[PDB]
Amino acid sequence: PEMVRGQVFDVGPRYTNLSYIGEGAYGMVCSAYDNVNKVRVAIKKISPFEHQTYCQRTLREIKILLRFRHENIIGINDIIRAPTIEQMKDVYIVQDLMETDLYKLLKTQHLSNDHICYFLYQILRGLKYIHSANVLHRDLKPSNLLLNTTCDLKICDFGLARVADPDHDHTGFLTEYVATRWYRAPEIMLNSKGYTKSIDIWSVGCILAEMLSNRPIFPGKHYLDQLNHILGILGSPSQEDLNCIINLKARNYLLSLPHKNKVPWNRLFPNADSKALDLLDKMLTFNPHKRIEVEQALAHPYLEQYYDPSDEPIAEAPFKFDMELDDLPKEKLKELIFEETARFQPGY
């Protein structure tokens, strides 16, 4: 059937010549050749059925990506799984192959201001579409941004992503420990169940910083250190910013901390375009409600060369509570995953 570092990819005969790209807790991604369409593809093997969270993430990613269509968001081309649900252990998501990700590119190349600007434009062009659909991506970082050699960029991995119908108040109903640590907005630590899509803008800020310096701006060692790295640079929150924190436990936890001074952006990035540091500052703002939104970040002067509302799609049918109905046993989620992938099956 064809094996990569001990992982069977039951994808033949259509998909062959598999090479490792990466892996995660419950799956693996490889490049492959599509013999039918005569194109290179990526194939993400997911093995989620043992755990309810893994089934949730798999269902979310499939439900969201199949209803999305945008140049800066990876599409699903095809999905492979067993013809019976008892036989389904693995799901194979087939996507267009991208040459590399931003993480790899930043280990090996100092980016020109022109590249950084185009990349940031494309991230925010994609995020605009995502937010307009009422989705939070919730794990933006360099390794979830794919790059082909023409410097085209696509956001991938909607595993951590979800819908939040703005018709309903999601304070207290949102998963606690979201985003990769270095890219985690302060309100996930201080308002752990009440954050909004603004956490995505924070993540994009961390990425913009990382692009300027080839280094993570807030490389914290653990939960409480990440908040210290952040305050180490933004300086202690203002009194108006503290009074805005509704959780008492978390408000007092801050009021307890020593005072820190703001490090000026231009003293951390003395070579960077000033327009870029201005947008960085509006994106890395402590108070979520004051943090620039995706439309206003595109309209910033730094991206004036690319910003064009007439060529920037938004979701024509924004997602609603019908896409959030996934607080269910893993056996039930397995059924919904089977139903959602049915349309790729011979028959249906």
Ligand SMILES: Cn1nccc1Nc1nccc(-c2ccn([C@H](CO)c3ccc(Cl)c(F)c3)c(=O)c2)n1
């Ligand atoms: C050549 N090259 N080098 C790096 C990336 C590529 N190309 C490529 N092309 C299409 C898709 C992907 C791709 C990668 C990573 N992920 C996430 C990791 O960020 C991922 C989540 C969960 C699990 Cl389990 C996983 F293995 C990988 C994708 O979803 C999808 N990559």
